Design a protein around this ligand. Structure first.
Ligand SMILES: Nc1ncnc2c1ncn2[C@@H]1O[C@H](COP(=O)(O)OP(=O)(O)NP(=O)(O)O)[C@@H](O)[C@H]1O
Ligand SMILES: Nc1ncnc2c1ncn2[C@@H]1O[C@H](COP(=O)(O)OP(=O)(O)NP(=O)(O)O)[C@@H](O)[C@H]1O
Ligand SMILES: [Mg+2]
Ligand SMILES: [Mg+2]
Length: 637
């Protein structure tokens, strides 16, 4: 059948379970590894998890950086948990001053204090990932432990990265080559020796490894892919897009699995399942440390999805009205930032907050940093581009609302492009400007959630004649990600900026611009100036009754609380209600064969769509046990 081809041959096969965000990909890949080891393959299963996902989903601790065999079985199976932040840390890491006499002392001391050696020695971002897939081929080629018949990779959710690291490696590698024969003083600005031979020998190797992965993924004999997703519409929608990319960079992908599908027979169980959760979580939201001080709003699910202008107005009646809109008194201007992990509905909320704001007499702006065409699907107007769009699909009335979509990516490369004398001087010994601008950003990309923190700070500045005059309250719907940043990087990313605007200020003088970096300084500091502002601004976490995203939200709120940010509000958004439980099962099961259909027909048979379908039933297990897993395993494969 299906699993027959995955027990197929002696030829080593690397199965990739990949997908996004809590489909069960881990228990999916785990279960597979098990049923595969059962079959007789000496098999290794792999995750890149800081949190040790594979560890407690096996119930045996594999968290050792190198492959761990499992005690308690006669089965041939190995777990592997790889450390990204130590992947780079381990693999990557005469006096004639007659120059000072000519007066060079000033210019050499300014360039040395531009600390180029740092920019040269800073490892390119994302490295360890690309190297990780390679670390795997290493333990298994090495054959130190056993002769590995199959490998099962549970990937980090959702190919450009092996490239960008190769590129940022090549840039750095080419510039240590221009550095072996070089002047005494030139080698001195980088801290570099007279011989780069051993370094460049080693950096070259690393890059060959980074290359080996992009080579292996496309490799037609060993590699195979399997997409994992849940029955929701967007999951099928998204998965299609990832098969587009899969047929694109041309890595073989033969199977999509659907997990957490509800069996018509035993469905009545699932209802009680979800229920124990809602209670557990809600209970937690009640008593949780630090959750206590912030506003709580429990909203129920709704009759059906909110695609429209009136619907949002009424949603607003539910969330912000039946509970307190007394958040509206304050200064004349108000900022509200809603954020939440993906799946919790925070557009329908954020939108509705803006809509309830509109008719209330007050001009308001909703900002969508979500690329998804979210807010475009929200008011159903397709608000596109970067400029404000006036808000109408009413019967005729006062519409004091605008909203705009700022792609956080287009917002980054807009900033990168804007940053694209001393040019000649650096080129003075040899030509470096290309390589050092591009690597000037190799220090710039390292921030994690900042694609959007661009867009936000952009509009923060937008108070002005054309706008600040026009607007009273505004609201930020962040993208379904990490825009919520809970440690102190705010004064410190600002110090990255001022550190390098001051180094650059140092060496602009010694060539006989950077005011832009001063514009960014004021924008960031003005973005910061409102975020930490007590009166005008407040933050909101939108979340759901599943106890996982609950205790997560608690943490992220507990940390955001002591981070100082005025987060005044939580929202537990889709609460199923008991009296409606009958309808809700038939509802979420209705979604199923809808989206299941929307998959069964996607872009013909050929490009993308339907490949080979794997259905995995929802309930009900802890699913953390080894035999549990063999069970899950025999059920699906
Ligand atoms: N089909 C399923 N049947 C029963 N329990 C499931 C199923 N899928 C997931 N779970 C449970 O969901 C929890 C976490 O899901 P998991 O299988 O680890 O998803 P994942 O692959 O790790 N995705 P991610 O959240 O991005 O790491 C575990 O406690 C599992 O027991
Ligand atoms: N209280 C509710 N009752 C019923 N349906 C809801 C409720 N809240 C949200 N929804 C539905 O869930 C969806 C929420 O999607 P959205 O507002 O984009 O946030 P999201 O779930 O994180 N999606 P995305 O941003 O693309 O990752 C909407 O399409 C609504 O139809
Ligand atoms: Mg995982
Ligand atoms: Mg959203």
């Amino acid at each position: 059948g299906v699993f027959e081809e995955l027990a197929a041959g002696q030829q080593r096969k690397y199965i990739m379970i990949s997908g996004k965000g809590g489909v069960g990909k881990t228990s999916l890949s785990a279960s597979l590894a098990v049923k595969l080891a059962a079959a007789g393959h000496t098999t290794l299963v792999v995750s890149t998890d800081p949190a040790h996902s594979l560890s407690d989903s096996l119930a045996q601790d594999v968290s050792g950086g190198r492959p761990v065999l499992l005690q308690g079985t006669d089965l041939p199976l190995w777990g592997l948990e790889i450390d990204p932040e130590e992947a780079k840390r381990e693999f990557f890491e005469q006096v004639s001053d007659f120059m000072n006499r000519m007066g060079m002392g000033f210019v050499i001391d300014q360039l040395k204090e531009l600390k180029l050696g740092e920019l040269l020695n800073t490892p390119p971002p994302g490295l360890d990932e690309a190297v990780a897939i390679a670390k795997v081929v290493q333990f298994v080629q090495a054959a130190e432990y056993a002769r590995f018949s199959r490998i099962v990779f549970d990937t980090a959710p959702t190919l450009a990265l092996p490239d960008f690291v190769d590129a940022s490696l090549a840039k750095v590698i080419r510039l240590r080559k221009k550095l072996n024969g070089a002047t005494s003083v030139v080698r001195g600005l980088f801290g570099a020796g007279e011989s780069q031979d051993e370094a460049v020998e080693k950096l070259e190797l690393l890059q060959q490894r980074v290359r080996m992965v992009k080579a292996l993924f496309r490799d037609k004999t060993q590699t195979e892919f399997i997409i994992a997703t849940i029955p929701t519409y967007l999951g099928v929608n998204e998965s299609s897009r990832l098969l587009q990319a899969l047929r694109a960079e041309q890595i073989p992908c033969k199977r999509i699995i659907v997990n957490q599908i509800v069996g018509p027979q035993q469905g009545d169980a699932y209802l009680r399942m979800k229920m124990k959760d809602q209670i557990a979580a809600l209970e937690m939201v009640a008593n949780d440390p630090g959750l206590r001080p912030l506003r709580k709003v429990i909203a129920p699910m709704v009759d059906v999805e909110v695609r429209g202008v009136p619907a949002l107005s009424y949603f607003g009646n539910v969330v912000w009205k039946d509970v307190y809109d007394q958040m509206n008194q304050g200064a004349d201007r108000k900022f509200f930032l809603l954020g939440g992990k993906g799946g919790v509905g925070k557009t329908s909320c954020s939108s509705s907050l803006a809509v309830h704001f509109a008719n209330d007499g007050l001009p308001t702006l909703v900002v969508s940093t979500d690329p998804a065409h979210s807010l475009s699907d929200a008011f159903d107007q397709d608000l596109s581009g970067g400029s404000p769009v006036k808000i109408t699909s009413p019967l005729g009335d006062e519409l004091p609302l605008w909203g705009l979509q700022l792609d956080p990516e287009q917002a980054k490369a807009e900033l990168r492009a804007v940053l694209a004398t001393l040019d000649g001087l650096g080129l003075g010994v040899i030509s470096d400007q290309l390589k050092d601008l591009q690597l000037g950003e190799l220090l710039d990309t390292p921030p994690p959630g900042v694609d959007e923190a661009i867009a936000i700070a952009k509009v923060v500045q937008f108070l002005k004649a054309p706008e600040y005059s026009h607007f009273k309250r505004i609201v930020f719907d962040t993208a379904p990600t990490g825009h919520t940043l809970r440690l102190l990087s705010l004064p410190d990313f600002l110090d990255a900026s001022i550190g390098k605007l001051v180094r650059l200020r140092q060496k602009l003088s010694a060539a006989t611009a950077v005011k832009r970096l001063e514009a960014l300084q004021a924008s960031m500091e003005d973005a910061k100036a409102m975020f930490r502002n007590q009166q005008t601004t407040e933050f909101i976490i939108v979340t759901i009754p599943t106890v996982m995203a609950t205790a997560e939200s608690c943490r992220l709120a507990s940390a955001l609380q002591h981070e100082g940010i005025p987060l005044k509000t939580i929202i537990v958004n889709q609460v199923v209600q008991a009296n409606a439980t009958d309808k809700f099962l038939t509802a979420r099961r209705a979604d199923q064969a809808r989206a299941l259909h929307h998959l069964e027909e996607d872009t013909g048979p050929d490009g993308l769509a339907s490949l080979q379908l794997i259905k995995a039933p929802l309930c009900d297990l802890e699913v953390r046990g080894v035999p549990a897993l063999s069970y899950f395993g025999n059920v699906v494969w």
